[PDB]
Design a protein around this nucleic acid. Structure first.
Ligand SMILES: Cc1cn([C@H]2C[C@H](O)[C@@H](COP(=O)(O)NP(=O)(O)OP(=O)(O)O)O2)c(=O)[nH]c1=O
Ligand SMILES: [Mg+2]
Ligand SMILES: [Mg+2]
Length: 430
DNA sequence: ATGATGACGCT
DNA sequence: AGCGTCAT
């Protein structure tokens, strides 16, 4: 009890842009706003692959990874925006630039870790301290939390969705201990006021809406984010964890959505995150390894220590294209041509990066998939990246992969390539 | 024929 | 180094 750490030491948020590529296209084209719409890449095979979906289209069953032609059977009035195509591949520059717009705004409030093109974690611990002093010991108005849900409330002795939100919020704030500058629940609340302000700023300055989770660590912040979407934010307190976890499938917790999560379920014969509390740390470590067992033991109690890394910029800059089915690359000249295309996009991105962010990449990773392999990558090789020159980079990547060709006739490439990937890495200051 | 990315762990 | 996992 008096020596048990409760993982209540930080305030962490996760901010996630709602249907982000869709919002980028809707800002640009007002005819798409407030409509069922999706973002598609390519167009020939089955209308293109959907990669993002507006909340109005999701109500019809439209999802990512559906073909647009199939999405149209569920939602006949679905509007589509197409990803730009440059040098015969998808080019995500518009979405990268929009993400930078958002991240720069977030960075005014606190330390951010870029988690993906449209998510960042935020460490609010310091911001909350500072804000607790100036606000003094005076109370926090619900009007400062207009889009916040307090997970697990209301509870105890209304018919509308906004009404439930306000009821829980009132219960929370009515129990808050406002004169104890170290109360975790108070710290979270202030964190949430800050996140409201951050979200208001993003929307005002970009037009983009997002959801957010506020809790004591990244895993709980991420989970919290997804609980009330879109355009809302959710506070998951330490106290809320036992009930929340008691029915929370294991696969919903970040890092457990794959093979390890499935093994936890199979080996232990459990279904929900809270059920982990029944095992000793050594038991868990015995099944899953020292690092994973320790992490699971703390996580199922709501405790997690992964720091929010101060990193707003990606650490690698890469370009790839899949060549599925009949388009698989089968001649030396095709392979070379496509490496050049990839290397030209890459050069463009790298030069821009070098001007914007004062750094230079030094390693080039070359990855390919071959026809028949159900892995992301059949093969990865590195080479020095000494000049930002597309012809050099493509020539080098070719060199590095060329003996993968089993074909006897030199013009041909067997087995055919179903993926090419160039990745610039090992950045240094410039 | 679920694409184009990106981070990190294991050995 | 190069492969495997998990994620958006
Ligand atoms: C998961 C995922 C996302 N994305 C892009 C499209 C989304 O617009 C953007 C953000 O991903 P997300 O946060 O997973 N999804 P979303 O932002 O579209 O939707 P949500 O509102 O966050 O659910 O990333 C992909 O291109 N491929 C993916 O597999
Ligand atoms: Mg999102
Ligand atoms: Mg996201």
């Amino acid at each position: 009890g008096p020596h048990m750490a409760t993982g209540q030491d930080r305030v962490v948020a996760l901010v996630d842009m709602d249907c982000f590529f869709v919002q980028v296209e809707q800002r640009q084209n007002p005819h798409l706003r407030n409509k069922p719409c999706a973002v598609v890449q390519y167009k020939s095979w089955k209308g293109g692959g959907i990669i993002a979906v507006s909340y109005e289209a999701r109500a019809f069953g439209v999802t990512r990874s559906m073909w647009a032609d199939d999405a149209k059977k569920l939602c006949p009035d679905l509007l589509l925006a197409q990803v730009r195509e440059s040098r015969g591949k998808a080019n995500l520059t518009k979405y990268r630039e929009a993400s930078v717009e958002v991240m720069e705004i977030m960075s005014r409030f606190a330390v951010i870790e870029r988690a993906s093109i449209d998510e960042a974690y935020v460490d609010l611990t310091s911001a909350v301290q500072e804000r607790l002093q100036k606000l003094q010991g005076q109370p926090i108005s619900a009007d400062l939390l207009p889009s916040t849900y307090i997970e697990g409330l209301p509870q105890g002795p209304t018919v509308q969705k906004e009404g439930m939100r306000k009821q829980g919020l009132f219960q929370w704030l009515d129990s808050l201990q406002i004169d104890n500058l170290t109360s975790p629940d108070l710290q979270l609340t202030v964190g949430a006021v800050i996140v409201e302000e951050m979200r208001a700023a993003i929307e005002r300055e970009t037009g983009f809406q997002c959801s957010a989770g506020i809790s004591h660590n990244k895993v709980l912040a991420k989970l919290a984010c997804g609980l009330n979407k879109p355009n809302r934010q959710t506070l998951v307190s330490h106290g809320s964890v036992p009930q929340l976890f008691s029915q929370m499938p294991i696969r919903k917790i970040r890092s457990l959505g794959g093979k390890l999560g499935a093994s936890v379920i199979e080996i232990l014969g459990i279904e929900y995150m809270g059920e982990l509390t029944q095992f000793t740390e050594s038991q868990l470590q015995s099944h899953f390894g020292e690092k994973n067992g320790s992490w699971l033991y703390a996580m199922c109690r709501g405790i997690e220590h992964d720091p929010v890394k101060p990193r707003q910029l990606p650490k690698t800059i890469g370009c790839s294209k899949n060549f599925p089915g009949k388009t698989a690359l089968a001649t030396r000249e095709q392979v070379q041509w496509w490496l050049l295309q990839l290397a030209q996009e890459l050069e463009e991105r790298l030069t821009k990066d070098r001007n914007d962010n004062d750094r230079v990449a030094t390693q080039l990773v070359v990855s390919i998939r071959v026809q028949g392999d159900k892995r992301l990558s059949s093969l990865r090789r590195c080479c020095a990246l000494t000049r930002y020159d597309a012809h050099k980079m493509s020539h080098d990547a070719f060199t590095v992969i060329k003996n993968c060709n089993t074909s006897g006739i030199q013009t041909e490439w067997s087995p055919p390539l179903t993926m090419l990937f160039l990745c610039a890495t090992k950045f240094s200051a410039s």
